[PDB]
Each structure stands twice: as structure tokens, then as C-alpha cells.
Amino acid sequence: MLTETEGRAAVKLARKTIEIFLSKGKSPRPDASGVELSPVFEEYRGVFVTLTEGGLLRGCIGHPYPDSTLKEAILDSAISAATRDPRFPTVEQDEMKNILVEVTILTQPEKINASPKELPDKVEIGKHGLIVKQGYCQGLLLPQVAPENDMDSIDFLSHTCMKAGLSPDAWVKGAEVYCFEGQIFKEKEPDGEVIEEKFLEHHH
Amino acid sequence: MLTETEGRAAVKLARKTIEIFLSKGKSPRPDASGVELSPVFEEYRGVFVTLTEGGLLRGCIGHPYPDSTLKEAILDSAISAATRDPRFPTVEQDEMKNILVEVTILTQPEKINASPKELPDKVEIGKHGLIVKQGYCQGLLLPQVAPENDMDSIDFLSHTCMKAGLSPDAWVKGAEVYCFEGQIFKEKEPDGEVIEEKFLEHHH
Amino acid sequence: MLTETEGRAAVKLARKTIEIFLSKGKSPRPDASGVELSPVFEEYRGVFVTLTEGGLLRGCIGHPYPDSTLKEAILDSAISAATRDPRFPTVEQDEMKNILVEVTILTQPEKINASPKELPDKVEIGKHGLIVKQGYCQGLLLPQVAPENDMDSIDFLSHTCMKAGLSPDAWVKGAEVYCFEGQIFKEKEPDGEVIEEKFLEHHH
Amino acid sequence: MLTETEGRAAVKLARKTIEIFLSKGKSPRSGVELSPVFEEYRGVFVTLTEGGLLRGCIGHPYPDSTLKEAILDSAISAATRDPRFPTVEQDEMKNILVEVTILTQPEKINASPKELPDKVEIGKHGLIVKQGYCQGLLLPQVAPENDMDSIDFLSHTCMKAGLSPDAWVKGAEVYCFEGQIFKEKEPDGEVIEEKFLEHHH
């Protein structure tokens, strides 16, 4: 989990990277964006960068898996959010002064160390996201999936298993299960104050 | 799909219903809200009422299934989003002047009339939410589920079947499949202009 | 479990029913077959009637579910095995003196009263056959299925759930689980000595 | 598919492997004319019956070994490694009937998922679902005996491989195979062939 300070740096970094990229058509050097980044940005974790304009979605791309360091993923996601979202036209430079940035940061996935019959009780609906990995098969469902679609812990484990391409009961037979959380930091005004949204799901 | 006019009427109904219930303690009569409602409100469709305060989630409750008329669904969902969301404290009367009201309206679910071999090509990821029905058993998944969790048509059909408590291949064996879409109307400001968000999914 | 006598009566009933049907062309009166029948024959349980000739399958029909009393189930399965097996022509009257009769009797299915956490431990592979029921959905898998296809308790419960048209994890969620056993009684010689085969499965 | 001649050689190989092992407590290979079919990789089961009752049966469903090797191993295990029965004594073989179930080499079904259910024949085909290093198989008698159509069979085999039931719909490889049974009508005597692997359909 990121502190308020780290959360603020996250959005500032996303905003900076985009503005830099919209100007010189090139991404900034990871450690030379003009934002102080604590060592947490070196951790491998997923993230999503959301852009809103006039209260409407303007673009959003992200890394669900911790395939990249937080730093790299923010850079890539932010530039992708403003220029690679096929649902929207590329954002122009002067548009950013009217665009609001949102950064959803996922925690480093940690293996739930329990026995098959204990797993349901260790999976918290509304807080946890899951990754099921067995052999070379891997699958994941974001935290909002379970609460927004009325799934209990047993349901969540089973759907994530099938998401991985495995049998729904794979978790019952010992499939490796990892859990992770998320947090959202967002601009209250362009380049302004940053607020934190604890809930990733709309409804539960 | 609701027109701008109807969408505006929907959000207004949500606000009024909440303000009235918060005022006294008796849910006003749906048609007796003071808000004009076209015949679209007599249609059976699912809905969600979302409240935000200062850019942060303040409450949200809904009924995804089309079991009540739009009018009644909004009514119930609105008061519940404000007083029955176990995630937040009850909304106080004086808080509504600082709250933004959002209303997500789902379309009347329509049966996909295609053989099992053709069903996947009928399901559009990003637009369609699904309902699988078999006898009295029924299950549904919101439109945003597939796009946000990298599921294709086949995955969505299989997952919705399991959500219904049925085998993942139930759709392959002729189980009924219904699809639906949604739209969001939200206040740019309390009791102010209402805009339309056509995207139910954050990312795809 | 049927006794040696009851089992002997089972085969004799099956054999006599056929010899009588083949001759006069009608089914004997259920209680005027010529074989003593204990009260076990009034219990609702499944059974199969097998006919072999010269060491080869000649016919086989049965009732997997306890839809009928043992008596009724045997008369019907016996006549069908001799005259209604689409894999073979109808048996001739002179053929019965060259045919061996086999009868597989299943026990009345009994609900396993255990929590999902206990279910796998209560299901004995190689002995138990399963029936899963949850509402109007019902499915069963014979005792030999699990041991012949290398399935453990967990696998067997999941496969029976899907057989019932339900999600594989239905048992983890509280779906009703019923177990049953079986035994085979067969003629060592035409209308001769009846021996009991305790294993319904070829391998395990 | 094995010829009748080969079918007879398979049961004799099974019977002799057991008598010899039961004699000097170990194994060779023989004295039985074996055609090249015994060098093919295919599953097999060896069954022993005595007095019309099962006396032992062990087998390898998957074609992990050549038929020859699978037969020797299965036969010896059927007589000395089946925990359901006590070990068979030397004197017992003269009163035991030998049965050998030989499965064909699994052949890939080359069709689109839409066509697979049409290619699977209930009653004849057994299935192996393969996706990477994950494999699963269900014997031919499974579908007809438990009232499963093609779709059911494909889905259950996918789960048997530890995969999602809809894996076959998503392109997982499917292989089909058949089997045949050759059995002794008399100890060390005549060998007939049972055409039906399923009890009931």
C-alpha cells in the first residue's frame, strides 16, 4: 500500500509523462520526470492510468499483472491512456489542462498460505483481487469483480481458476492462489489536490 | 436506451426520492415525486444509483435484474444507496447539497436467438452484459466484467453460466442466453446539468 | 447390501421373467413369477440386467436411478435386456438355455450429511456411486467411473455436479450429495449356481 | 487395431509372462511370435477371472509404452499387485481366464471446435484432451454408461485433464482412441474377441 505522498507522486508522474510525451513525442527518462519517487516505485505491481474530461472517461490503459516495476508501468500506461485507447481520439497537448488524472495502484501479489479448505476464509470480498497459477497456467480477476457481481469467496476462487484456463475446482486440489489489493489516487482538479478512493468497486 | 430527456428525468427522480426520504422517513410515491416520467419508466429494467461527494464514492446500491419497473427500481436503489450501503454511514439531509447523483440504467434483456455454435459471435465484449437462464436458475454478469478482465465471448458465456450455478458448458447445450447494455447519467453538479457516460467499463 | 438368498432370487426373477415373456409373449404377474421375494424387492433402487452368451455380451438394460421398486425395475430391465437392446436382435426362446443372466443391484441412495469440508472424506472411491441434486437438477455417475478413470473424491464430486448440469463447485456450495453402492449376482451356469461379484469396477 | 492372430499373441504373452514370473520370480522376454504391432505405443489392460469372478486387473490407459512392455507390466501387476485380491499362486493359473484390452494409438481429431461434437462417437471413442503438458482421458465406456452425449464427454475430459470444461471450445487438442478385447474361452485355450467395451448404452 502507498502512502498519501506516494499516491500523489503516482498521479503527478502519470500527468508529467503524458505532458512530456505530448510535447516532444518521446517519453521522459524514468528517473528524470520531475517527480520524487520513493523506493516503492521500484516494486513490481500492476497499475491503471485513467483520464477523465468534463466528468466523462477520456482514456484508460493499465497493467493488471506485476509484470513491470510501478515506475515503468505508470509511464507506459499513462502514455497509452492518452494515445493508445482505441475508444477515444488521441489527447492533444492543450487538453491536459482540462483533463483529470487517476492512478489505480495494485499491491504486490502475495501467495495465500492456507490449505484448500481454508482458502475461502482468507479471501476477502471487496478487498481482494486474485491470481490463480498452476504450472504454466495463469489467470486473474480484479477486486471489483466479486462484490459487483455478487460472488462469495468460493465463487471468486472458482471463477479465477477458470479464468486461468483451469478447472473451477483446481483451488480445491491445491492450485496456487495469490491475492492483491488496490487503491485509487485521483486529481480533484487539473494538476491540483490529490484525493484517495479506498473502494475499487462501485457496489457490494 | 433512454434519451437525454429521460436520462435527466431519471437522475432527478433519484435525487428527489432521497431528499424526500431523508426529509421525513416515508418513501414518496414513485409517480408522485413531482418529476415527469415518460413511458420508458414503466419498463422493467435493472438500475444502480450512485452517490459521490467531493469526487469520492459516498454510496451505491442497485438491482441488476429487470424485476421492477425503471421507476420503482430507481426509487428503491436511490434510498438504499443513501441509507443502506453497509460501507458508508447514512447520508445526512444537509449532505445532499454536496453530493453528485449518478444513475446507471440497463436495457431490457433480450434473448439471443442463435444456436450454440453461433452464440459467441452474438456476444459483443464491452457492450453486452449477460443473463443465462435455465428453468428457474438464473445468473448475470455486468457489461464491464469481460473487457476489464480479458475475457472473450466464449469466456463470458462460460463464466455467466457458472454464475447461474450451472456448468460452464450449459450454453453449449442450449441454455437460454439474454444480453443487455447500459448507460450512465450523472450530475455535473448537484441538481445541475446531466451528462451521459456511454462507457460502463474503465478499460478494455 | 442384499444377502446371498436375495441376490439368488434377483437373478431367478430376471431369468424367469424373460423365459415367460419370450414364451407366452407377456410379462408375468410381479408376485406370481415363481421366485420368493423378501421386502427388499419393494425398495426403490436401481438395477441392471445383463445377458451373456458364450462369454460375450448378449444384452444389457437397467435403471440407474431408484425410480422404481427393485421388483418392477428387474422385470422391466430383464425384458428390455432380452428384447429391447438396439445393439442386438431379440433373444430367441431356445437361446436362454445357452445364456447366463447377471443382475447388478444398487442400494437406495443415501444423503451424505456432511459439510463441504467433510464431503471428500465421506466419498469412498471404488465403492460409492454419486447423485448430486440441487432443485430440479439431478445427475449421477456409476461406482466404476471414479476408479476406472483415476478420479479421487474431489474429482468425483465435481464431475457428478457437472453431470447434473451444475457448476463443478456446486458441492462446495452445499449442493445435496447422495451416495450408493452396488453388487452383482450372476449365473455360473444357465439357470444354475449364482455367484456374487463384489467389484463393479474393472480396475482402480 | 490388432489382427486376430495378434490378438491371440497378446493374451498368450500376458499368460506366459505371469506363469514365468510366478515361477522364477522374474521377467524376460518368451516364446511368442510378436508382430511389429507390439512395438507401437498404446494403452492396455490385463484382466484375470476365475470361476466367473474378477481375480485381478491392472492397466495403463495412456500410450506411454510400447504394447509389448505395457502387456508384460500390466499382466504381472494384475496377478501380484492388485490390492483388491490376494496374490495369485502358481497352481491357480490353470483355472484362470486371461483377458487383454488393447487400445488403439490416439489420433488427433482435426476439426474446428464447432465440428468436434460431430466427430466424437459415443460408445466407440475414448478421449484424451491435451493442452501443453496437461493431459486427461476418459475410457470409451464412460460416455455410454453414464448417459453423456458428445458435448458432455468433451467437457468432462477437459476437466479430467485439470482444465476448464470449455477448453475444447477454446481450441484444446482432442485425441480419440478405441479399444478391443481378446479373451480366453478356456485357460490356455481358444481366444475370442468382445466387440463391446461398454456394458450398457
PDB file of C-alpha atoms in Angstrom, chain B residues 34-193:
ATOM      1  CA  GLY B  34     -43.121  15.795  -8.831  1.00  0.00           C
ATOM      2  CA  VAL B  35     -40.852  14.624 -11.634  1.00  0.00           C
ATOM      3  CA  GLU B  36     -42.314  13.973 -15.098  1.00  0.00           C
ATOM      4  CA  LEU B  37     -41.753  10.394 -16.308  1.00  0.00           C
ATOM      5  CA  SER B  38     -42.217   9.168 -19.886  1.00  0.00           C
ATOM      6  CA  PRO B  39     -43.492   5.621 -20.520  1.00  0.00           C
ATOM      7  CA  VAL B  40     -39.907   4.331 -20.626  1.00  0.00           C
ATOM      8  CA  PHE B  41     -40.042   4.375 -16.835  1.00  0.00           C
ATOM      9  CA  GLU B  42     -42.751   1.704 -16.811  1.00  0.00           C
ATOM     10  CA  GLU B  43     -40.309  -0.698 -18.463  1.00  0.00           C
ATOM     11  CA  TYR B  44     -38.725  -3.477 -16.436  1.00  0.00           C
ATOM     12  CA  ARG B  45     -35.004  -2.875 -16.321  1.00  0.00           C
ATOM     13  CA  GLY B  46     -32.094  -3.078 -13.922  1.00  0.00           C
ATOM     14  CA  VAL B  47     -30.547   0.061 -12.427  1.00  0.00           C
ATOM     15  CA  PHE B  48     -27.943   1.321  -9.984  1.00  0.00           C
ATOM     16  CA  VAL B  49     -27.940   4.623  -8.121  1.00  0.00           C
ATOM     17  CA  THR B  50     -24.536   6.019  -7.259  1.00  0.00           C
ATOM     18  CA  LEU B  51     -23.746   8.932  -4.982  1.00  0.00           C
ATOM     19  CA  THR B  52     -20.395  10.729  -4.832  1.00  0.00           C
ATOM     20  CA  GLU B  53     -19.162  13.529  -2.578  1.00  0.00           C
ATOM     21  CA  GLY B  54     -16.011  15.507  -3.303  1.00  0.00           C
ATOM     22  CA  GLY B  55     -15.043  13.139  -6.109  1.00  0.00           C
ATOM     23  CA  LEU B  56     -15.266  10.172  -3.725  1.00  0.00           C
ATOM     24  CA  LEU B  57     -17.830   7.348  -3.587  1.00  0.00           C
ATOM     25  CA  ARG B  58     -20.496   8.120  -0.987  1.00  0.00           C
ATOM     26  CA  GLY B  59     -22.858   5.248  -1.667  1.00  0.00           C
ATOM     27  CA  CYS B  60     -24.237   2.927  -4.320  1.00  0.00           C
ATOM     28  CA  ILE B  61     -26.940   0.282  -4.470  1.00  0.00           C
ATOM     29  CA  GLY B  62     -28.724  -1.282  -7.424  1.00  0.00           C
ATOM     30  CA  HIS B  63     -30.794  -4.141  -8.872  1.00  0.00           C
ATOM     31  CA  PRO B  64     -29.096  -5.616 -11.965  1.00  0.00           C
ATOM     32  CA  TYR B  65     -32.047  -7.861 -12.857  1.00  0.00           C
ATOM     33  CA  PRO B  66     -35.092  -6.371 -14.645  1.00  0.00           C
ATOM     34  CA  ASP B  67     -37.507  -7.385 -11.874  1.00  0.00           C
ATOM     35  CA  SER B  68     -39.091  -3.970 -11.204  1.00  0.00           C
ATOM     36  CA  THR B  69     -40.155  -1.078 -13.429  1.00  0.00           C
ATOM     37  CA  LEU B  70     -37.421   1.506 -14.019  1.00  0.00           C
ATOM     38  CA  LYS B  71     -39.400   3.936 -11.872  1.00  0.00           C
ATOM     39  CA  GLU B  72     -39.594   1.584  -8.852  1.00  0.00           C
ATOM     40  CA  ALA B  73     -36.028   0.304  -9.274  1.00  0.00           C
ATOM     41  CA  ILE B  74     -34.629   3.847  -9.183  1.00  0.00           C
ATOM     42  CA  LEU B  75     -36.775   4.702  -6.150  1.00  0.00           C
ATOM     43  CA  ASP B  76     -35.616   1.765  -4.056  1.00  0.00           C
ATOM     44  CA  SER B  77     -31.980   1.892  -5.238  1.00  0.00           C
ATOM     45  CA  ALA B  78     -31.689   5.620  -4.514  1.00  0.00           C
ATOM     46  CA  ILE B  79     -32.876   5.485  -0.894  1.00  0.00           C
ATOM     47  CA  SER B  80     -30.735   2.380  -0.293  1.00  0.00           C
ATOM     48  CA  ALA B  81     -27.618   3.929  -1.821  1.00  0.00           C
ATOM     49  CA  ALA B  82     -28.075   6.781   0.633  1.00  0.00           C
ATOM     50  CA  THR B  83     -29.131   4.909   3.760  1.00  0.00           C
ATOM     51  CA  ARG B  84     -28.421   1.219   3.308  1.00  0.00           C
ATOM     52  CA  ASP B  85     -24.884   0.942   1.924  1.00  0.00           C
ATOM     53  CA  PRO B  86     -23.057  -1.059   4.658  1.00  0.00           C
ATOM     54  CA  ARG B  87     -19.804   0.534   3.502  1.00  0.00           C
ATOM     55  CA  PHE B  88     -20.729   4.077   4.489  1.00  0.00           C
ATOM     56  CA  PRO B  89     -22.516   5.955   7.265  1.00  0.00           C
ATOM     57  CA  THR B  90     -26.051   7.109   6.442  1.00  0.00           C
ATOM     58  CA  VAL B  91     -26.204  10.248   4.329  1.00  0.00           C
ATOM     59  CA  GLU B  92     -27.420  13.252   6.314  1.00  0.00           C
ATOM     60  CA  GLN B  93     -30.058  15.632   4.966  1.00  0.00           C
ATOM     61  CA  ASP B  94     -27.617  18.552   4.639  1.00  0.00           C
ATOM     62  CA  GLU B  95     -25.169  16.369   2.693  1.00  0.00           C
ATOM     63  CA  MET B  96     -27.269  16.119  -0.483  1.00  0.00           C
ATOM     64  CA  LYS B  97     -26.345  19.686  -1.411  1.00  0.00           C
ATOM     65  CA  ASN B  98     -22.736  18.487  -1.595  1.00  0.00           C
ATOM     66  CA  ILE B  99     -23.448  15.188  -3.354  1.00  0.00           C
ATOM     67  CA  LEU B 100     -23.479  14.209  -7.032  1.00  0.00           C
ATOM     68  CA  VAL B 101     -26.113  11.696  -8.153  1.00  0.00           C
ATOM     69  CA  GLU B 102     -25.437   9.072 -10.823  1.00  0.00           C
ATOM     70  CA  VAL B 103     -27.875   6.603 -12.321  1.00  0.00           C
ATOM     71  CA  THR B 104     -26.923   3.544 -14.353  1.00  0.00           C
ATOM     72  CA  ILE B 105     -29.815   2.245 -16.430  1.00  0.00           C
ATOM     73  CA  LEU B 106     -29.668  -1.184 -18.045  1.00  0.00           C
ATOM     74  CA  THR B 107     -31.696  -2.145 -21.132  1.00  0.00           C
ATOM     75  CA  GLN B 108     -34.457  -4.754 -21.202  1.00  0.00           C
ATOM     76  CA  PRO B 109     -32.566  -8.073 -21.555  1.00  0.00           C
ATOM     77  CA  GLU B 110     -33.116  -9.595 -24.987  1.00  0.00           C
ATOM     78  CA  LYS B 111     -32.806 -13.290 -25.782  1.00  0.00           C
ATOM     79  CA  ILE B 112     -30.104 -14.151 -28.277  1.00  0.00           C
ATOM     80  CA  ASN B 113     -31.834 -16.339 -30.841  1.00  0.00           C
ATOM     81  CA  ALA B 114     -28.921 -18.363 -32.164  1.00  0.00           C
ATOM     82  CA  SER B 115     -27.673 -21.936 -31.974  1.00  0.00           C
ATOM     83  CA  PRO B 116     -24.846 -22.718 -29.518  1.00  0.00           C
ATOM     84  CA  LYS B 117     -22.244 -22.683 -32.306  1.00  0.00           C
ATOM     85  CA  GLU B 118     -23.228 -19.096 -33.138  1.00  0.00           C
ATOM     86  CA  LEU B 119     -23.699 -17.581 -29.673  1.00  0.00           C
ATOM     87  CA  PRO B 120     -20.103 -16.322 -29.208  1.00  0.00           C
ATOM     88  CA  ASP B 121     -20.318 -14.168 -32.371  1.00  0.00           C
ATOM     89  CA  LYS B 122     -23.513 -12.632 -30.979  1.00  0.00           C
ATOM     90  CA  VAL B 123     -21.905 -11.542 -27.711  1.00  0.00           C
ATOM     91  CA  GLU B 124     -20.075  -8.216 -28.003  1.00  0.00           C
ATOM     92  CA  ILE B 125     -17.426  -7.718 -25.341  1.00  0.00           C
ATOM     93  CA  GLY B 126     -17.579  -4.172 -23.998  1.00  0.00           C
ATOM     94  CA  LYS B 127     -21.211  -3.559 -24.840  1.00  0.00           C
ATOM     95  CA  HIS B 128     -23.075  -6.641 -23.641  1.00  0.00           C
ATOM     96  CA  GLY B 129     -23.774  -7.869 -20.155  1.00  0.00           C
ATOM     97  CA  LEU B 130     -25.277 -11.373 -19.975  1.00  0.00           C
ATOM     98  CA  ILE B 131     -28.040 -13.331 -18.324  1.00  0.00           C
ATOM     99  CA  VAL B 132     -28.084 -17.118 -18.548  1.00  0.00           C
ATOM    100  CA  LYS B 133     -31.405 -18.778 -17.798  1.00  0.00           C
ATOM    101  CA  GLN B 134     -32.252 -22.437 -17.385  1.00  0.00           C
ATOM    102  CA  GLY B 135     -35.579 -23.239 -15.821  1.00  0.00           C
ATOM    103  CA  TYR B 136     -35.693 -21.251 -12.596  1.00  0.00           C
ATOM    104  CA  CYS B 137     -31.890 -20.924 -12.269  1.00  0.00           C
ATOM    105  CA  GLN B 138     -30.508 -17.595 -13.471  1.00  0.00           C
ATOM    106  CA  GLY B 139     -27.225 -15.711 -13.329  1.00  0.00           C
ATOM    107  CA  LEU B 140     -25.875 -12.430 -14.628  1.00  0.00           C
ATOM    108  CA  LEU B 141     -22.621 -10.610 -15.194  1.00  0.00           C
ATOM    109  CA  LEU B 142     -22.285  -6.877 -15.800  1.00  0.00           C
ATOM    110  CA  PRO B 143     -21.048  -5.493 -19.162  1.00  0.00           C
ATOM    111  CA  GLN B 144     -17.791  -4.259 -17.662  1.00  0.00           C
ATOM    112  CA  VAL B 145     -16.748  -7.704 -16.469  1.00  0.00           C
ATOM    113  CA  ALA B 146     -15.461  -9.129 -19.762  1.00  0.00           C
ATOM    114  CA  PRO B 147     -13.489  -6.093 -21.050  1.00  0.00           C
ATOM    115  CA  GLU B 148     -11.895  -5.359 -17.676  1.00  0.00           C
ATOM    116  CA  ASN B 149     -10.770  -8.965 -17.131  1.00  0.00           C
ATOM    117  CA  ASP B 150      -9.607 -10.005 -20.597  1.00  0.00           C
ATOM    118  CA  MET B 151     -12.485 -12.381 -21.374  1.00  0.00           C
ATOM    119  CA  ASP B 152     -13.612 -13.133 -24.944  1.00  0.00           C
ATOM    120  CA  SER B 153     -17.151 -14.164 -25.931  1.00  0.00           C
ATOM    121  CA  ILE B 154     -16.560 -17.821 -25.072  1.00  0.00           C
ATOM    122  CA  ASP B 155     -15.200 -16.946 -21.620  1.00  0.00           C
ATOM    123  CA  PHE B 156     -18.104 -14.596 -20.852  1.00  0.00           C
ATOM    124  CA  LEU B 157     -20.694 -17.226 -21.823  1.00  0.00           C
ATOM    125  CA  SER B 158     -18.948 -19.884 -19.721  1.00  0.00           C
ATOM    126  CA  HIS B 159     -18.472 -17.609 -16.718  1.00  0.00           C
ATOM    127  CA  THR B 160     -22.074 -16.368 -16.785  1.00  0.00           C
ATOM    128  CA  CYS B 161     -23.272 -19.986 -16.832  1.00  0.00           C
ATOM    129  CA  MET B 162     -21.280 -20.796 -13.712  1.00  0.00           C
ATOM    130  CA  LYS B 163     -22.558 -17.559 -12.165  1.00  0.00           C
ATOM    131  CA  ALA B 164     -26.015 -19.071 -12.659  1.00  0.00           C
ATOM    132  CA  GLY B 165     -24.912 -22.138 -10.680  1.00  0.00           C
ATOM    133  CA  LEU B 166     -24.776 -24.136 -13.903  1.00  0.00           C
ATOM    134  CA  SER B 167     -21.999 -25.997 -15.686  1.00  0.00           C
ATOM    135  CA  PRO B 168     -19.728 -23.789 -17.853  1.00  0.00           C
ATOM    136  CA  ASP B 169     -20.868 -25.622 -20.971  1.00  0.00           C
ATOM    137  CA  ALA B 170     -24.574 -25.079 -20.291  1.00  0.00           C
ATOM    138  CA  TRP B 171     -24.685 -22.511 -23.106  1.00  0.00           C
ATOM    139  CA  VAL B 172     -23.174 -25.096 -25.451  1.00  0.00           C
ATOM    140  CA  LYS B 173     -26.037 -27.431 -24.581  1.00  0.00           C
ATOM    141  CA  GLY B 174     -28.778 -24.941 -25.422  1.00  0.00           C
ATOM    142  CA  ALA B 175     -29.195 -22.920 -22.218  1.00  0.00           C
ATOM    143  CA  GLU B 176     -31.014 -19.591 -22.707  1.00  0.00           C
ATOM    144  CA  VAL B 177     -28.833 -16.511 -23.083  1.00  0.00           C
ATOM    145  CA  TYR B 178     -30.023 -12.904 -22.796  1.00  0.00           C
ATOM    146  CA  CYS B 179     -27.864  -9.836 -23.375  1.00  0.00           C
ATOM    147  CA  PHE B 180     -28.247  -6.237 -22.234  1.00  0.00           C
ATOM    148  CA  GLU B 181     -26.424  -2.922 -22.297  1.00  0.00           C
ATOM    149  CA  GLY B 182     -26.293   0.130 -20.091  1.00  0.00           C
ATOM    150  CA  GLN B 183     -25.835   3.875 -19.922  1.00  0.00           C
ATOM    151  CA  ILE B 184     -24.926   6.237 -17.104  1.00  0.00           C
ATOM    152  CA  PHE B 185     -26.452   9.645 -16.450  1.00  0.00           C
ATOM    153  CA  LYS B 186     -24.722  11.793 -13.887  1.00  0.00           C
ATOM    154  CA  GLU B 187     -24.988  15.324 -12.498  1.00  0.00           C
ATOM    155  CA  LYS B 188     -22.202  17.732 -13.421  1.00  0.00           C
ATOM    156  CA  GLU B 189     -23.294  19.426 -10.202  1.00  0.00           C
ATOM    157  CA  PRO B 190     -25.991  18.934  -7.556  1.00  0.00           C
ATOM    158  CA  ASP B 191     -29.356  19.460  -9.219  1.00  0.00           C
ATOM    159  CA  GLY B 192     -27.466  20.760 -12.244  1.00  0.00           C
ATOM    160  CA  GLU B 193     -26.816  19.630 -15.811  1.00  0.00           C
TER     161      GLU B 193
END
